[PDB]
Amino acid sequence: LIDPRAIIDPSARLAADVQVGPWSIVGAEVEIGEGTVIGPHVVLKGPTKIGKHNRIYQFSSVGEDTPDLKYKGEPTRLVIGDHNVIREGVTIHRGTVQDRAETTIGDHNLIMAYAHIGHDSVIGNHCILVNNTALAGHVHVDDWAILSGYTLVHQYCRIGAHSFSGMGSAIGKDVPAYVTVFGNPAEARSMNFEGMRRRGFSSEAIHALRRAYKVVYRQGHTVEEALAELAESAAQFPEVAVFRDSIQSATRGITR
Amino acid sequence: MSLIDPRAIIDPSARLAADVQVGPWSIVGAEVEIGEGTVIGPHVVLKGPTKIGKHNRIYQFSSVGEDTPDLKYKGEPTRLVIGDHNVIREGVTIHRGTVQDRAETTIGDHNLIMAYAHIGHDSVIGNHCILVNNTALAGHVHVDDWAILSGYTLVHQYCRIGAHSFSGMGSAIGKDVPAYVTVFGNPAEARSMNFEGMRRRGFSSEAIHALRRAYKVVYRQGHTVEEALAELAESAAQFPEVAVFRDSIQSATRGITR
Amino acid sequence: SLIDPRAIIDPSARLAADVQVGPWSIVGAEVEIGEGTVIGPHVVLKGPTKIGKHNRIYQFSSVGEDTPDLKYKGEPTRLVIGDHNVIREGVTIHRGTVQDRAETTIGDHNLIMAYAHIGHDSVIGNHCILVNNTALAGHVHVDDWAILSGYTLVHQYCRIGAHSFSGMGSAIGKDVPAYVTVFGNPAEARSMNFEGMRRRGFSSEAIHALRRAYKVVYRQGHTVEEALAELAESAAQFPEVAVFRDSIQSATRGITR
Numbered sequence: 103l104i105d106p107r108a109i110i111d112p113s114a115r116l117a118a119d120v121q122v123g124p125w126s127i128v129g130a131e132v133e134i135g136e137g138t139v140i141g142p143h144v145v146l147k148g149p150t151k152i153g154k155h156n157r158i159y160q161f162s163s164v165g166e167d168t169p170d171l172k173y174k175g176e177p178t179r180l181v182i183g184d185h186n187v188i189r190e191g192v193t194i195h196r197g198t199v200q201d202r203a204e205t206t207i208g209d210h211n212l213i214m215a216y217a218h219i220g221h222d223s224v225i226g227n228h229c230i231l232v233n234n235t236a237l238a239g240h241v242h243v244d245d246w247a248i249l250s251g252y253t254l255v256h257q258y259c260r261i262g263a264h265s266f267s268g269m270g271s272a273i274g275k276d277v278p279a280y281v282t283v284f285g286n287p288a289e290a291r292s293m294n295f296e297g298m299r300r301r302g303f304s305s306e307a308i309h310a311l312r313r314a315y316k317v318v319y320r321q322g323h324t325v326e327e328a329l330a331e332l333a334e335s336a337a338q339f340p341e342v343a344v345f346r347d348s349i350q351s352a353t354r355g356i357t358r
Numbered sequence: 359m360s361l362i363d364p365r366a367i368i369d370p371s372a373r374l375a376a377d378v379q380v381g382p383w384s385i386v387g388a389e390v391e392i393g394e395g396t397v398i399g400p401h402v403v404l405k406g407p408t409k410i411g412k413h414n415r416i417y418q419f420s421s422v423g424e425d426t427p428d429l430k431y432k433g434e435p436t437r438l439v440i441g442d443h444n445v446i447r448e449g450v451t452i453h454r455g456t457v458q459d460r461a462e463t464t465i466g467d468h469n470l471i472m473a474y475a476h477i478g479h480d481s482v483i484g485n486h487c488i489l490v491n492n493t494a495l496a497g498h499v500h501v502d503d504w505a506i507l508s509g510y511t512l513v514h515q516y517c518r519i520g521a522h523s524f525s526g527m528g529s530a531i532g533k534d535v536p537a538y539v540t541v542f543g544n545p546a547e548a549r550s551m552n553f554e555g556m557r558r559r560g561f562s563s564e565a566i567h568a569l570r571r572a573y574k575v576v577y578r579q580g581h582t583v584e585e586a587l588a589e590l591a592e593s594a595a596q597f598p599e600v601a602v603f604r605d606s607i608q609s610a611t612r613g614i615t616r
Numbered sequence: 617s618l619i620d621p622r623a624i625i626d627p628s629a630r631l632a633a634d635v636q637v638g639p640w641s642i643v644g645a646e647v648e649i650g651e652g653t654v655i656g657p658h659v660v661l662k663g664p665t666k667i668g669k670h671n672r673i674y675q676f677s678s679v680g681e682d683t684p685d686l687k688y689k690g691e692p693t694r695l696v697i698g699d700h701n702v703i704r705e706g707v708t709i710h711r712g713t714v715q716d717r718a719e720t721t722i723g724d725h726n727l728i729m730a731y732a733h734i735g736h737d738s739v740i741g742n743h744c745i746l747v748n749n750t751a752l753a754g755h756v757h758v759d760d761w762a763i764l765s766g767y768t769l770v771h772q773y774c775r776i777g778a779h780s781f782s783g784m785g786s787a788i789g790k791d792v793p794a795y796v797t798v799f800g801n802p803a804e805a806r807s808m809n810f811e812g813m814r815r816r817g818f819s820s821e822a823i824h825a826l827r828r829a830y831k832v833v834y835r836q837g838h839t840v841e842e843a844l845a846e847l848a849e850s851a852a853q854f855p856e857v858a859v860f861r862d863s864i865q866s867a868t869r870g871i872t873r
């Protein structure tokens with residue numbers, strides 16, 4: 103199960119059926135839960151917790167210190183949930199005491215080759231980060247978001263649930279839930295209707311989300327005006343409340 | 359000249375031809391065939407079913423023949439075919455095909471694929487292409503001969519990159535690039551013909567002028583595509599190069615980078 | 617040992633006595649490593665290369681590899697790296713070509729983050745920061761204290777000026793003058809790196825002279841020639857304005873506007 107050419111630190115803690123491939127390093131204070139497969143040529147550093155049934159591929163560095171100059175060697179953490187796939191060359195950094203001391207990833211995420219997850223980022227569930235996506239630090243990615251290849255997210259931005267970014271987008275402000283963005287700099291285009299259909303949203307919730315986009319983006323209202331105008335649909339539709347909530351949480355502006 | 363470092367892992371079903379080298383801590387997986395004289399560096403992962411031809415060079419930290427990660431493309435067998443005299447630099451990822459399309463990723467001869475480049479599932483690369491650092495072919499991309507993609511060129515799924523074309527660094531390509539065309543930017547826009555390339559490869563003065571003219575006919579005279587094509591019939595019969603240009607345009611159902 | 621028994625150290629390699637080398641790393645022929653330097657696991661080091669003192673090189677890096685530049689033909693070109701540099705995961709640094717310097721050169725105290733690329737014949741000064749996936753195509757000169765943010769792309773032969781700043785995803789095809797901030801693809805000059813200047817302790821007076829100099833180059837409709845002439849005076853009074861002026865004067869590809 104554990105290749106004899108792997109190095110397993112004595113204070114690492116592995117569940118019974120964890121696999122580790124040849125020439126991988128599971129460093130000190132690393133915990134790996136049941137059914138997780140660590141590939142060959144993987145470096146894991148702690149303190150880090152990896153859950154169950156994950157898959158981590160060759161040339162990944164998971165749990166390293168951020169090279170960010172404000173980190174001074176504090177024992178910050180990285181927590182990863184269950185059923186995640188972490189592909190070739192992914193870098194995931196642990197947190198900083200200036201935020202939460204913790205980088206957190208949830209469950210069922212797909213993190214493709216050479217993606218980067220900076221210190222203090224928080225990823226929800228069911229997200230997809232396509233190749234070379236970079237979260238610079240303190241980035242929050244809510245459930246079911248899809249960021250296409252080479253998407254660059256600035257520090258402190260929030261990516262809403264079910265949002266989508268086109269290839270090579272450079273994101274410098276929050277992306278509301280469901281919004282599709284493209285370009286450098288990123289601009290809002292429409293809504294991720296395929297992601298709604300993938301999740302069996304009602305046709306009525308979809309039409310209401312279509313209106314909700316118009317309210318914020320196509321009617322010249324201010325954010326506050328838009329918020330009041332959505333208030334009703336938010337109460338009627340949880341789907342719309344998620345949209346409404348992401349815009350309300352965007353203290354530092356939405357992508358337009 | 360053969361040297362198989364004993365720290366590498368070679369599957370019993372892998373097939374190695376004469377003069378093959380494999381560096382330490384590399385993995386030549388099941389159903390990988392490696393042709394004559396090919397050099398695999400250290401820290402390479404090869405996964406099959408994959409056929410690699412002769413006199414290739416594959417550098418460290420490359421993953422060649424992996425499955426595409428979206429499990430929505432489960433299926434097997436799917437394959438990878440790489441021809442002869444290719445250079446594959448550090449950290450290159452090349453994925454096999456999918457049963458949902460052609461079941462094969464294909465690379466021809468004499469290509470240079472630079473560090474951290476990505477060749478997505480079902481893509482097809484011809485011969486004498488250059489993919490500069492971190493070029494990313496998303497999937498089902500066809501790159502025709504002699505094309506050059508500068509550093510961090512991103513190509514959308516299903517796009518065709520024409521023979522002898524050129525992309526400036528950081529291009530984001532969402533539509534087909536006709537043969538000989540130069541594109542730049544995100545999103546990518548057409549700027550001119552790749553005259554630097556045409557000169558370096560020995561194109562006739564006569565062919566170069568006819569291509570300069572044909573660019574104008576497609577992009578600058580305000581014709582429709584379909585008109586522009588009809589106007590090119592006569593030049594295309596006289597100049598094989600103009601024919602290659604015309605054909606790339608004619609086979610862009612997707613649309614062309616304007 | 618300090619040298620992991622699973623590493624490969626070439627007989628011709630020269631290592632100072634307290635150098636550390638992790639498992640499954642390669643120190644190639646004619647590679648020299650100075651005192652206090654730590655080489656991680658899974659690092660490929662090739663020569664002829666000289667690495668200095670107290671550097672740290674992380675896993676999956678290839679340092680001292682041949683350039684893929686098709687003009688390169690197997691010549692013993694060099695790579696020189698100074699002291700107190702950090703080279704993070706997956707970084708690629710290629711040696712020179714005989715067609716230019718025969719050497720790629722890096723100074724001291726630089727921070728080169730993951731998957732950055734330093735192309736053949738580049739020269740990096742001191743105290744630079746190259747954020748993740750910054751790519752220097754070749755023959756790129758980066759002067760001291762420059763910060764290139766993530767995914768900054770630098771065309772071959774470009775010069776990045778001292779104390780300049782590029783925004784995330786910048787694609788730089790022209791020279792960036794000293795102290796200038798650039799953003800976008802294609803990169804555009806926005807302002808000066810005032811935040812940079814304050815973090816390094818520049819005097820109010822120098823910052824003001826630099827502010828005025830920016831205007832002379834970017835905001836008065838001067839040709840380059842005319843701006844240079846008009847900066848002569850202030851460049852004579854302030855070393856920083858001279859550095860600025862020199863970066864404009866030495867442009868081979870024109871300057872970012």
Ligand SMILES: CC(=O)N[C@H]1[C@@H](OP(=O)(O)OP(=O)(O)OC[C@H]2O[C@@H](n3ccc(=O)[nH]c3=O)[C@H](O)[C@@H]2O)O[C@H](CO)[C@@H](O)[C@@H]1O
Binds near residue numbers: 362643644662681
């Ligand atoms: C002239 C000089 O100073 N160095 C050159 C030399 O480096 P060098 O000989 O270091 O590079 P190699 O890749 O040939 O070998 C690296 C190291 O790995 C070892 N090894 C190699 C293969 C193997 O199967 N098992 C094994 O143990 C060698 O014994 C050596 O110590 O060749 C390289 C091209 O190949 C060039 O880029 C370098 O410029």
Ligand SMILES: CC(=O)N[C@H]1[C@@H](OP(=O)(O)OP(=O)(O)OC[C@H]2O[C@@H](n3ccc(=O)[nH]c3=O)[C@H](O)[C@@H]2O)O[C@H](CO)[C@@H](O)[C@@H]1O
Binds near residue numbers: 555
């Ligand atoms: C594949 C290869 O050997 N690359 C090297 C080559 O690049 P390359 O041959 O592209 O470099 P040059 O700077 O000499 O090319 C001149 C200019 O022509 C452009 N151009 C190039 C090719 C083309 O088909 N069409 C075109 O328009 C380039 O973008 C550049 O702006 O020389 C550079 C300068 O020593 C090196 O940094 C590269 O490592």
